[PDB]
Structures are given as C-alpha cells and as structure tokens.
Curated annotation (Swiss-Prot):
Protein name: Nuclear receptor ROR-gamma
Domain NR LBD, first and last residues per copy: 7-229
Family: Belongs to the nuclear hormone receptor family. NR1 subfamily.
Domain of life where this protein originates: Eukaryota
Amino acid sequence: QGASLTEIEHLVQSVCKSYRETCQLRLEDLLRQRSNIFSREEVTGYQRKSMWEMWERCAHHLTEAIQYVVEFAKRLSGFMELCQNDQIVLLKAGAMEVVLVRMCRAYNADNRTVFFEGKYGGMELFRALGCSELISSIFDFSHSLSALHFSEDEIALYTALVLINAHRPGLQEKRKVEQLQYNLELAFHHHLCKTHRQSILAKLPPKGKLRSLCHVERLQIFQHLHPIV
Ligand SMILES: CCS(=O)(=O)c1ccc(CC(=O)Nc2cc(-c3cccnc3OCc3ccc(C(=O)OC)cc3)cs2)cc1
C-alpha cells in the first residue's frame, strides 16, 4: 500500500493475468462467432417465450457472468486482504457495472448484435421482457464502448477501477480501498502511456453513466464470494 513504479508494472501484469484467467469467453472465440447470427425463425422463437422464461434465461447468464467478475476481484492484489464487509460492498455496487463493460466484447457494432446463447442477435431478441428502453440503453452503451476499440488489458485495468472505488457507501476500511484505488489508477495511466493510448481517457464513459444504467443483493454477493465454507 503506496507502491513504487516497478511495483506498479507488477500490478499491471497481475490485473491483466487475473482478467485472462476469469474473462469467461476468449475474445478470439467471440470475434470468430460474429458470422453466427440468429435466423428470423430463431428470433421469433425467443419473442414467443414468456417474459418469465426470458428472465430465467437472462438471470442464469448474468449470474454466471457475475461469478467470473467475483473471481476477478478475488485475484486482484489486496482485495482478499480487505475486510469481508468491504469485499461485499465493492462487489455488490460494482459487479453488474463490470459485466456491462465486459459485455462490449460480445457486441458487434456492424450489425448491432450481441452474443447470447451461442449466436449473435439484435435487441428484438429481448422483446418478451417488455423493457425496450432498458435493452436499448445497454446496446447504446456497448456501441459507444465498442467505438473506443478497447483492448483486453484496457478492459482489465478499467474494470479493476470500476470495482475498486473508495466512494462506495458502507466502506468500513475506506483508507485501505483508497490506497488500492490510487495504485490501480496510476497502473492504468502508466499502461496507457506505454501503449500510446492516453487518448482513450477523455473518450471513456463519464462519472455516473455506469451508475445511472445500474446493486446486487448482499447474500447473492457473499454466495459468489464463499460458495463453500
Ligand atoms: C460478460 C463476459 S463475456 O465473456 O464477454 C460474455 C459475453 C456474453 C455471453 C453470453 C451472454 O450471457 N449474453 C447475454 C446477453 C444479455 C443481454 C445483452 C444485452 C441486453 N440485455 C441482455 O440481457 C437482458 C438484461 C436485462 C436486464 C439487465 C439489467 O440488470 O439491467 C441493467 C441486463 C440485461 C444477457 S446475457 C457470455 C460471456
């Protein structure tokens, strides 16, 4: 806590490692499946489903996704050293925000499609849910984040910062989180300088944009954290 520049580069590689081990689906794999688009008949099949079936499916995939985000935070340096309440507060407030950012990888801007259950489909795939403005907002955010051409390492380092934020209410050890955050900010800025990507900082979604689009229940976060005691 309060790291030197050599320590900061160990922290960049570390976060990038943790991300690669918990990225769920390989970027190469997602990119290669872009040609696999749902047929008009497959779309109709999803639209005919009850909102209850669709929610169950969506909830299953989001749960799976959140689990990979939880494993990502657990592998972050200093996260496991924080108290249990801070670990829960940080994950409860940020896990869905991280899933949304990570989802930009499964998004194809050419045809405005998202990878869902094995193929790519537009927002009409979610018609049954009855929440057009919400689905629209998610595709909008993904489309804006796609335009940035966000690298795997840029995502790893930015999502570490979405999670490790000392401004979350309910933090008991606020100063421990701040130290972690300051080291990750510098690790992010330093990596952007090494890769000549300083330009993306002004292009990133602003303060509150990720928060307005989005909190997980305290028990469902502890569940992902400690699945066996
Ligand atoms: C992530 C890491 S990855 O490895 O890139 C990877 C990427 C994809 C997959 C496949 C997959 O799961 N696709 C999925 C897509 C969607 C989805 C997409 C767009 C709009 N809506 C969607 O769902 C509806 C919905 C309803 C309420 C909320 C909410 O809470 O409102 C804020 C959020 C979403 C859900 S699941 C696996 C791994």
